[PDB]
Design an enzyme around this catalytic site. Structure first.
Site, mmCIF file in Angstrom:
data_model
loop_
_atom_site.group_PDB
_atom_site.id
_atom_site.type_symbol
_atom_site.label_atom_id
_atom_site.label_comp_id
_atom_site.label_asym_id
_atom_site.label_seq_id
_atom_site.Cartn_x
_atom_site.Cartn_y
_atom_site.Cartn_z
ATOM 1 N N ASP A 284 0.878 -1.170 0.000
ATOM 2 C CA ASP A 284 0.000 0.000 0.000
ATOM 3 C C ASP A 284 0.921 1.227 0.000
ATOM 4 O O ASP A 284 2.109 1.136 0.364
ATOM 5 C CB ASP A 284 -0.897 -0.021 1.256
ATOM 6 N N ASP B 166 -0.214 5.038 0.860
ATOM 7 C CA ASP B 166 -0.498 6.046 1.890
ATOM 8 C C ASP B 166 -0.484 5.467 3.312
ATOM 9 O O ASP B 166 -1.242 4.548 3.641
ATOM 10 C CB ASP B 166 -1.847 6.720 1.633
HETATM 11 MG MG LIG Z 1 -2.788 3.202 3.508
#
Ligand SMILES: [Mg+2]
Ligand SMILES: [Mg+2]
Ligand SMILES: [Mg+2]
Ligand SMILES: [Mg+2]
Lengths: 245, 245
Positions: free
Chosen positions: B8, B10
């Protein structure tokens, strides 16, 4: 003896939506030895730029670049600030318009819908039943149906009636859309700024100068000497006759 | 012994919506000496690219870049073709959705509306009552009202009921929007392509791995070894422990 030559772009200086011919481009730079030169177009700046040079060459090649009819303005290489449609119309009329359009389009059933049905520009709202995020083949498909069913034309009739007296105008945006803009924000809009720049004469050249055409108002305006052309070559010859006799 | 680490972006590799820390970036390139590395994010490619390098550096810095949850994929520097939402949902459900949204939003009265109320992406439709073409101050203004009036939440409740059983899912898109996407087109979508690439192990790292989080499904999927992190530094340390003990 301060003179501006101001040109429509499509059909006046270039084939519609295509790159200027190098010879025409070359003449315009020569013309610049006698007068200032400017362009005014309904398209956005990126499109106009792309037709008139590589990169941002256009703002260096022309003294004035008026995109979206002058709501966006470059003057001698410098971007000027622009009045926004929301500032001019106010939020309440703007949202009345927007919600009428959303409501109308909700009830339209097409072969395909995509997205960006309402595009907020500087000079206007662009309204598109299919959605501006469609492909070229999808545009042609919509176009064919639109002629059969008068989709955009009927929409505009409904909008004009609904907003009668409230200062909105409408114009065709190609195959898939129409524009909504404030009264007076046709090509004449650029003449208001030009008014402060002490030109002795502004010559305007356009290929749609008959009533209904997108050059009519700026052509007929008493602030311009109007010239009606049928091609980029015609524009060059007319300029030769006037400025290089 | 063919291993992929899939991250991922962010809160996992970067501060949310901001540039990666050079030290983290440096470690990831070192990690590449032991394993292949990839990123998966809900944002579009331009955003992810911007967080992870200058230019298109990202597709060279990572073996896989999965934007919009993998509906857009770069693999070893090469853009792969992507299934479109219209192809997957069909035109009739798609337009049913679109027209319901247009109709619902027509009846919403806000302080301000702009444009691009429905943005057609690859991975989804992004729906925004105010319109995606608003400014940052306008976003905050909408955000504040949205909390007071549950504008997006109520819209989504209406959509879920209306389309019950039809394979649509919904998620928050920041302050002003929500996404509509097909069932299964969460982050797991990228695992389907990865399935053909003969990895012995896929390690997934995410910071929203609890139920409701946008990493939950890919974390819990039996095709990944899941890792739950709370920061980019935590991600680096976890990787050090596993791959550089
Ligand atoms: Mg995230
Ligand atoms: Mg023309
Ligand atoms: Mg005149
Ligand atoms: Mg797993």
């Amino acid at each position: 003896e301060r003179v501006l030559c101001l040109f429509d772009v499509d059909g006046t200086l270039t084939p519609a939506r295509q790159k200027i011919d190098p010879e025409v481009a070359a003449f315009l730079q020569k013309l610049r030895s006698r007068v200032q030169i400017g362009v005014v177009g309904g398209s956005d700046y990126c499109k106009i730029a792309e037709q008139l040079g590589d990169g941002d060459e256009v703002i260096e090649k022309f003294d004035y670049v008026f995109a979206e009819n002058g709501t966006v303005q470059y003057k001698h290489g410098r971007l000027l600030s622009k009045q926004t449609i929301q500032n001019h119309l106010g939020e309440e009329l703007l949202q009345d318009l927007i919600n009428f359009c959303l409501s109308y389009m909700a009830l339209l059933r097409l072969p395909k819908k995509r997205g960006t049905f309402i595009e907020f520009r500087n000079g206007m709202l662009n309204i598109s039943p299919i959605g501006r995020s469609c492909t070229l083949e999808e545009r042609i498909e919509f176009s064919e149906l639109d002629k059969k069913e008068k989709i955009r034309e009927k929409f505009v009739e409904a909008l004009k009636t609904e907003f009668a007296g409230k200062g909105l105008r409408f114009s065709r945006g190609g195959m898939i859309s129409f524009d909504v803009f404030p009264e007076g924000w046709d090509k004449r809009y650029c003449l208001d700024s030009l008014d402060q720049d002490s030109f002795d004469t502004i010559h305007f050249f356009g290929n749609e100068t008959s009533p209904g055409g997108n050059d009519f108002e700026i052509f007929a305006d008493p602030r311009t000497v109007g010239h009606s052309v049928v091609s980029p070559q015609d524009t060059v010859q007319r300029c030769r006759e006037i400025f290089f006799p």
